[PDB]
Amino acid sequence: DYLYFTTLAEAQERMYDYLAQRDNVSAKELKNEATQKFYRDLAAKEIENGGYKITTTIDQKIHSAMQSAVADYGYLLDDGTGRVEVGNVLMDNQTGAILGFVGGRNYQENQNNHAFDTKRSPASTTKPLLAYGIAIDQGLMGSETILSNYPTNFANGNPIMYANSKGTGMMTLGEALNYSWNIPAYWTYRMLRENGVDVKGYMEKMGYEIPEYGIESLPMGGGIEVTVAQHTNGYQTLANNGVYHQKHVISKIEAADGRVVYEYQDKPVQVYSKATATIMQGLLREVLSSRVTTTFKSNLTSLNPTLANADWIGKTGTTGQDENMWLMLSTPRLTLGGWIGHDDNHSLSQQAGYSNNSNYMAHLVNAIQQASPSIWGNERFALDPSVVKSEVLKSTGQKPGKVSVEGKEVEVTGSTVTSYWANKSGAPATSYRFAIGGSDADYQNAWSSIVGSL
Ligand SMILES: *C(=O)[C@@H](NC(=O)[C@H](C)NC(=O)CCCCCN=[N+]=[N-])[C@@H](C)O
Ligand SMILES: [Cl-]
Ligand SMILES: [Cl-]
Ligand SMILES: [Cl-]
Ligand SMILES: [Cl-]
Ligand SMILES: [Cl-]
Ligand SMILES: [Cl-]
Ligand SMILES: [Cl-]
Ligand SMILES: [Cl-]
Ligand SMILES: [Cl-]
Ligand SMILES: [Cl-]
Ligand SMILES: [Cl-]
Ligand SMILES: [Cl-]
Ligand SMILES: [Cl-]
Ligand SMILES: [Cl-]
Ligand SMILES: [Cl-]
Ligand SMILES: [Cl-]
Ligand SMILES: [Cl-]
Ligand SMILES: [Cl-]
Ligand SMILES: [Cl-]
Ligand SMILES: [Cl-]
Ligand SMILES: [Cl-]
Ligand SMILES: [Cl-]
Numbered sequence: 001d002y003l004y005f006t007t008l009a010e011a012q013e014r015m016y017d018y019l020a021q022r023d024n025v026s027a028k029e030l031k032n033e034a035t036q037k038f039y040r041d042l043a044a045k046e047i048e049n050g051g052y053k054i055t056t057t058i059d060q061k062i063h064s065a066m067q068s069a070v071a072d073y074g075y076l077l078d079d080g081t082g083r084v085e086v087g088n089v090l091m092d093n094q095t096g097a098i099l100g101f102v103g104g105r106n107y108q109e110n111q112n113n114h115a116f117d118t119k120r121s122p123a124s125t126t127k128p129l130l131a132y133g134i135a136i137d138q139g140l141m142g143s144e145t146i147l148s149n150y151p152t153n154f155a156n157g158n159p160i161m162y163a164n165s166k167g168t169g170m171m172t173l174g175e176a177l178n179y180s181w182n183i184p185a186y187w188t189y190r191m192l193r194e195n196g197v198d199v200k201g202y203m204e205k206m207g208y209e210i211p212e213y214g215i216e217s218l219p220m221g222g223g224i225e226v227t228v229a230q231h232t233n234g235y236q237t238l239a240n241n242g243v244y245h246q247k248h249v250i251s252k253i254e255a256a257d258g259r260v261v262y263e264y265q266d267k268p269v270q271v272y273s274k275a276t277a278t279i280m281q282g283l284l285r286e287v288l289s290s291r292v293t294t295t296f297k298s299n300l301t302s303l304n305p306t307l308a309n310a311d312w313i314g315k316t317g318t319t320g321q322d323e324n325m326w327l328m329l330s331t332p333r334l335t336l337g338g339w340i341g342h343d344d345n346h347s348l349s350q351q352a353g354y355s356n357n358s359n360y361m362a363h364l365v366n367a368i369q370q371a372s373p374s375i376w377g378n379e380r381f382a383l384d385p386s387v388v389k390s391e392v393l394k395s396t397g398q399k400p401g402k403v404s405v406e407g408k409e410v411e412v413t414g415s416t417v418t419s420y421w422a423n424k425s426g427a428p429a430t431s432y433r434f435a436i437g438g439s440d441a442d443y444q445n446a447w448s449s450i451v452g453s454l
C-alpha cells in the first residue's frame with residue numbers, strides 16, 4: 001500500500017547515494033544519465049535482494065488507525081462533485097518524524113500518493129508562514145496591528161476579492177486571520193517586498209521551492225505548489241516555537257550485519273524567533289475557535305470533547321475555483337496536514353473545506369487519539385518570555401498620542417488592548433498611516449471614524 005511504496009522509494013534514493021559514494025563515483029560521473037540509470041537499478045536490486053533493515057518513524061498503531069479512519073469516514077468528503085481525494089501527514093513537532101499518513105481514499109482503486117507526490121497550491125495556509133509570520137518576525141506588526149481591508153486592485157487592475165466582497169475597512173490581524181481576508185495579506189506581503197525582506201531565506205530554511213517571490217498573491221497561494229508532507233513541515237516549524245526539523249519517514253538503513261547505509265541527521269533551524277512563533281500560535285488558536293472558515297472545533301468537541309480541549313491551532317485554505325481545500329492543525333506535540341481535491345483539478349463544492357474536510361479531519365484526529373491516547377498531548381502553547389507586550393489603541397494598533405489629521409493636531413485616545421510584538425521596543429506611537437496598507441482615501445475614511453469617536 002502507500003506506506004510500502006513511499007518507504008521503498010525513499011530507501012532506494014538513500015541506497016543510490018550510499019552505493020555511488022561506496023563505488024567512489026565522482027559528482028561529474030553522477031551527471032552521466034547512463035551511470036545514474038545503473039545506480040538507480042543497483043539501488044533497487046540491493047533493497048530487493050540485500051536483506052537491509054529499514055527503520056522508519058512510522059507509529060504502526062497510529063498509521064493503521066489512520067488507514068481505518070479514511071476507509072470508514074473518507075465518504076464524509078464526498079460533496080456531490082464526484083469521489084474526493086485526500087492526503088494527510090501526521091508529524092512530530094519536536095523531530096519532524098512522520099508518524100503516519102493518508103495517501104488517498106483507497107490504494108486498490110487509485111495509487112496516486114496525495115501525501116508525498118501530489119503538489120497543489122496551499123492557498124490561504126501560506127499566509128501565516130510567508131506574510132504575517134515574517135512581518136511579526138521583522139518587527140513590522142504585532143498581534144493587534146491594524147491592516148487595510150479597503151478595496152484595492154492587483155497590478156493587472158483586477159479587484160482583490162474575498163467571495164463576493166471587494167473588501168470592508170480597517171481590521172485587526174486577528175479578524176484578518178479568522179476570516180482569511182485577502183487584502184490584508186496582500187498589503188502585508190507588499191510591505192515585505194517594499195522593505196526588501198529576505199522572504200526566500202525563511203521559506204527555503206523550511207524546504208519550500210517557490211520560483212517567483214514577486215507574485216502579489218503569494219500569501220493566497222499564487223505561485224506556490226506543495227505536497228502535504230512539505231506543507232505539514234511549515235506548520236511543524238510554527239508549532240515547534242519556530243524551530244524547523246526536516247520531515248522524514250526513514251530514520252536508518254542498516255545492512256544485515258548492522259553496517260549503517262544511512263542515518264537521518266537532525267539539523268534544527270530557528271526559522272522564526274520564539275516570540276514570533278508563540279504570537280502566531282495564539283492567533284491560529286483563534287482561527288479554529290472562531291469557527292469562521294472551519295467547523296473543526298464543533299466537529300471534534302462532539303466526537304471527543306476531552307481531545308477538543310487540547311490546545312488546537314490551525315489554518316484553512318481554499319484555491320480560487322474551490323479546486324483544493326486545506327486544513328493544517330497542530331497541538332504542541334503534533335501537526336496534521338490535510339488536503340482534499342480532485343486528481344483532474346475540477347472544483348469541489350463551496351463548503352467542502354469548511355464542513356466536509358473539517359468533519360473528516362475531526363474523525364482522523366479522534367482515530368489517532370484512540371490508537372495512541374497520549375500522542376496529541378495536554379501541553380498548552382504559551383507566549384515566549386521574549387514577547388513584548390504593548391498597550392495600544394484598539395482603533396490604530398499603535399500607542400496613544402498626537403497625530404496630524406487634515407492640519408489639526410489631534411489627541412488620539414480611547415479603548416486600549418495588549419498587542420504582542422517580536423521586536424525589542426514593541427508597538428510604535430500612532431502615526432497617520434497606522435495600518436498595514438491603505439490609500440489616502442482609505443485613511444481619510446478611517447480617521448473620520450476614529451476622530452468621530454474622540
Ligand atoms: C485563502 O485560501 C483564500 N483564497 C483565495 O484567495 C483564493 C486563492 N482565491 C480567491 O478566493 C479569489 C479568486 C476568485 C476570482 C476573483 N473573483 N473574480 N472575478 C481565502 C479567500 O479562502
Ligand atoms: Cl499505507
Ligand atoms: Cl506511495
Ligand atoms: Cl555491489
Ligand atoms: Cl510502531
Ligand atoms: Cl493547485
Ligand atoms: Cl488599486
Ligand atoms: Cl474575528
Ligand atoms: Cl525574497
Ligand atoms: Cl515546496
Ligand atoms: Cl524576487
Ligand atoms: Cl525519509
Ligand atoms: Cl551484511
Ligand atoms: Cl528566539
Ligand atoms: Cl473552541
Ligand atoms: Cl460550527
Ligand atoms: Cl480559507
Ligand atoms: Cl481552484
Ligand atoms: Cl478526478
Ligand atoms: Cl502546558
Ligand atoms: Cl500565553
Ligand atoms: Cl513587555
Ligand atoms: Cl506599552
Ligand SMILES: [Cl-]
Pocket residue numbers: 139423424425426
Ligand atoms: Cl525594536
Ligand SMILES: [Cl-]
Pocket residue numbers: 187191435436437
Ligand atoms: Cl504598509
Ligand SMILES: [Cl-]
Pocket residue numbers: 439440441442
Ligand atoms: Cl487615494
